[PDB]
Symmetry: C2
Subunit: 497 residues, 2 copies
């Protein structure tokens, strides 16, 4: 077999990116300032964190074993519980004490045959008393919200119709449905999209099979009262390339950014309309809604080039690190229109941004608040001379949060400081009676000065000021998505506005 | 109640001394070099590590909750398990989410009444299939060697005759007895010493009550074939001072360093002879043995002033930090002599030293190898300009290990580097046929450059060279004592030579 390294090497595991790989508990975290005593619930987040050194040199960040953090809040006290998802990969590599899974989404490079290749490392959501650890090439892994025990690969009582489950399901705050899909839904390189939903009782509702015009990456999607929307990243899969040891994904400069629109209820596959947006990168969806005219307003991060630059086109053509900016775009779609080409979107702010969150009490409906990561290159905001040598590589950089009020157009910016970077934030309603976007924001900080992580608590009344700074004595590696589960919500999801 | 701080403050919890307070697992630790594949067993060590900020300002290092590390070795792979001892203090403070136990060994400063005040933070030994977590003011806490679960306070099947159990019991490699004592054995300020032993079947053998000439600290003791030896540190307890909120311990410049000698088997309390060594500090015992003439050779660290300078005399007189050196002393004692005063000891090396270990296969018998911590002020050995600002306070410093061959007088020195310090080492016999002092030495390093801990593996053939350096991504706070439990030893202790 290819030799197993016994320590981490390369930029993707250097400095703040060095795996810690700890599982367990740190109770009664140190707090500077004061955590509001009324906050009760759990912040769950997932990070890719390789458990064993890869036999693949410069293995991408996206290929690391999913490690779940829970921050349990009550009466102004907070405890950390941390545990790896027991994926097939994790368990078999732990048994062998060496890496066995090969390149990102390329089973032809694996040293043994895997049934499930999930690292379960992208999102961690709450559904019917379980956590679901998500990776878009796989079904979810079900976990205990209290102990972070892994129950195992989850098939929704045998109802899961798809080999794949999106990392970005939407929770309808009115119907209490989980709205889902999977792409490559019949295996590697398939153009099959399976759109499916679960009612609050756990019974499957929608199941529609449709066909993508290309085998393109559909990372995120949008849900409105009457439509589901599938934006396709112009990364394209060729299985014959994979069989020769090549990348699952390859940029295609020659195709539009396709945006599929399907009726949400009772549709057949042929009802999808593949609208054609100007060529670009489909970032994360903030939210979508139908306006008075019945037009879909799709608000999402949008770049004009390949954000995933490490997967360039067939001729190795693509941007360099830190070159590509994504902007907060609004696309207008009319399902009734027979005109497939779409106009350039309007932009809601100027900031280089990503990781948009809304008040999920208005998810699938008109929202007027968005919280998002920003990356400001303006001199002094980040001390790059100090941070870059300590940062390692492979992960996106955010040096603040912004709150956009969509009605007033007012923007507040949180800057943690010149030697700190942020992850994706969560929003917490102040209480069950709170107005949209009124309450608390939490975000994990990388402190390059201490080489420690911190959890910031902000009040939406003034996003510039930390109400509390929770000081971890370890690093939590830069991660991906996370969610708030409020103690006052019996089903784990907030009540509609 | 006195207010509970919500973050650590003061020098004793700054820099490398900042509590981490993690419990759980890090498997498959990163290794530079190669762990010898034949090493099979577990290195257990204990550190004081406050679980909650103290309401006592500048609480000494010795007062922190005991946290147990196990390093489990097999086939050149190593896993860390880490867990706090569930002392009465730990459990009640965890339930309250605040500190309740007050000053070191002063129950009159506690915010609630404790039955047991142990932090179980000084030593961690193996006895008849359990770990015993030791603190000289208390009985042991019994723990599971595999899971580090705490069973609870241990009374040896109801046989424990003493309120107190030394942190330095001796294991007779021939008789397989655990030889023990406790001082202040009938409560705070009592001069009662209880000498007691357990046979390998767990049955109590010796129990002798004797009387100390002063209520002095007896931290360590020595055992030979026919004698047990009690060196008294001139720190003295006055319970009336403690009732007013004063220190348990106060230096007395006016007394000798008493060295009690008692027949090991069948003695009465009145058989003890209190020899009087020149005034000084009784450090850790390397080992004691009877020579041809039946004279006790007692080899131990010995200083001429108060090493525990934070507990000065009645007028606040004593040394400053880093002023007092301890030296590797040999005392000669003849139980038959009626002459109480003892000559100044001979010194085996010139190094400022402590934490002596021998090959425990010759414990209580003639030894010819000692491994010990050294602190070398020779310019360049430690980069003090870099280290001191990052070190915090309250813990002793060691910047190397030395191996003394007692026959040849040859000394090898291990220097981890100018920005690293060491803990107490362990010795591992190469195999059951190995000569005395032949095998492996392990020692935990504090790396002030990375602010991480490392576990060094040395071969006794050349102590100057690391065979392996195990790289922890977290800090293990400077700790106290530790022990090797070899897989090849059914009772957890090595076979006699
Ligand atoms: Cl599990
Ligand atoms: Cl326990
Ligand atoms: Fe995502
Ligand atoms: Fe000791």
């Amino acid at each position: 077999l290819p030799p197993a390294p016994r320590y981490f090497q390369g930029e993707n595991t250097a400095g703040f990116m060095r795996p810690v790989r700890f599982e367990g508990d740190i109770t009664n975290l140190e707090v500077v300032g004061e955590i509001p005593k009324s906050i009760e619930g759990t912040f769950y987040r997932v990070m890719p964190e390789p458990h064993l050194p890869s036999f693949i040199p410069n293995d991408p960040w996206f290929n690391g074993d999913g490690n779940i953090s829970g921050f349990y809040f009550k009466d102004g006290h907070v405890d950390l519980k941390q545990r790896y998802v027991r994926t097939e990969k994790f368990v078999r590599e732990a048994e062998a004490r060496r890496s066995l899974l090969g390149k990102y989404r390329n089973r032809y490079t694996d040293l043994v045959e895997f049934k499930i290749r999930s690292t379960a490392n992208v999102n961690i959501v709450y559904w019917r008393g379980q956590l679901l650890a998500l990776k878009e090439d796989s079904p979810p892994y079900a976990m205990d919200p209290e102990t972070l025990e892994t129950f195992g690969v989850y098939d929704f009582d045998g109802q899961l119709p798809s080999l794949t489950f999106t990392a970005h399901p939407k929770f309808d705050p009115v119907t209490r449905e989980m709205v889902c899909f999977g792409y490559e839904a019949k295996g590697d390189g398939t153009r099959d999209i399976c759109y499916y939903s679960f009612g609050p009782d756990g019974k499957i509702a929608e199941t529609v099979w449709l066909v993508s015009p290309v085998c393109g990456m559909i990372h995120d999607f949008a849900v409105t009262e009457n439509f589901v929307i599938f934006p396709i990243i112009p990364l394209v899969c060729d299985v014959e390339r994979m069989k020769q040891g090549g990348d699952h994904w390859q940029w295609d400069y020659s195709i539009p950014m396709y945006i599929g629109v399907l009726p949400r209820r009772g549709a057949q596959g042929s009802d999808v309309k593949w609208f054609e947006a100007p060529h670009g990168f489909a970032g994360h969806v903030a939210n979508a809604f139908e306006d008075d005219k019945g037009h879909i307003q799709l608000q999402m991060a949008y770049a004009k080039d390949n954000v995933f630059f490490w997967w360039p086109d067939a001729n190795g053509k693509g941007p360099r690190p830190g070159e590509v900016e994504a902007h907060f775009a609004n696309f207008v779609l009319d399902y009734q229109s027979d005109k497939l080409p779409l106009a350039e979107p309007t932009y809601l702010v100027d900031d280089d941004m990503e990781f948009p969150r809304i008040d999920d009490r208005v998810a699938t409906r008109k929202h007027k608040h968005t919280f998002f990561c920003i990356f400001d290159r303006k001199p002094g905001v980040t001390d790059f001379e100090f941070v870059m040598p300590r940062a390692g590589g492979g992960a996106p950089m955010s040096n603040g949060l912004a709150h956009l009020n969509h009605e007033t157009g007012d923007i507040q910016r949180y800057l943690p400081g010149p030697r700190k970077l942020t992850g994706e934030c969560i929003f917490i309603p102040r209480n069950s009676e709170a107005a949209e976007g009124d309450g608390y924001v939490m975000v994990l900080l990388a402190n390059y000065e201490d080489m420690c992580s911190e959890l910031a608590v902000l009040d939406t009344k003034d996003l510039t000021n930390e109400v509390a700074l929770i000081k971890l004595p370890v690093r939590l590696r830069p991660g991906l998505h996370g969610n708030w589960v409020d103690k006052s919500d019996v089903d784990g999801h907030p009540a509609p506005l």
